[PDB]
Write a protein that binds this ligand. Sequence first.
Ligand SMILES: *C(=O)C[C@@H]1O[C@@H](C)[C@@H](O)[C@@H](O)[C@@H]1O
Ligand SMILES: [Ca+2]
Ligand SMILES: [Ca+2]
Ligand SMILES: [Ca+2]
Length: 114
Amino acid sequence: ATQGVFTLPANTRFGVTAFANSSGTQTVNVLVNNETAATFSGQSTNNAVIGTQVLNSGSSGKVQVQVSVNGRPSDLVSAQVILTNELNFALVGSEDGTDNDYNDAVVVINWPLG
Ligand SMILES: *C(=O)C[C@@H]1O[C@@H](C)[C@@H](O)[C@@H](O)[C@@H]1O
Ligand SMILES: [Ca+2]
Ligand SMILES: [Ca+2]
Ligand SMILES: [Ca+2]
């Protein structure tokens, strides 16, 4: 199935944060209105926070996460979790290789803010 795609409430602020756990340099693209709105990059095997940003979910609310390592797209896994009918997490893991730990870039989207 498609992974890394989340429908947020439209025109709404959200946080997006990426962590790295791989020998390979991660490039994380966050898309709003179907175009890259933020790019994070780094190289860490100790969960470095390679980027964090506040974005707006855009006209449709559709937010997409894509991850690449040396120009090759990583395989994604994702889910959305809601606590007390109010607090939202959109979660992405990604795999750049063969060990299937899916932590090579980890992305956490959260809303509402403020
Ligand atoms: C290459 O070594 C594979 C790569 O980096 C490792 C250190 C480990 O984090 C693995 O999950 C990642 O795919
Ligand atoms: Ca891996
Ligand atoms: Ca890893
Ligand atoms: Ca608050």
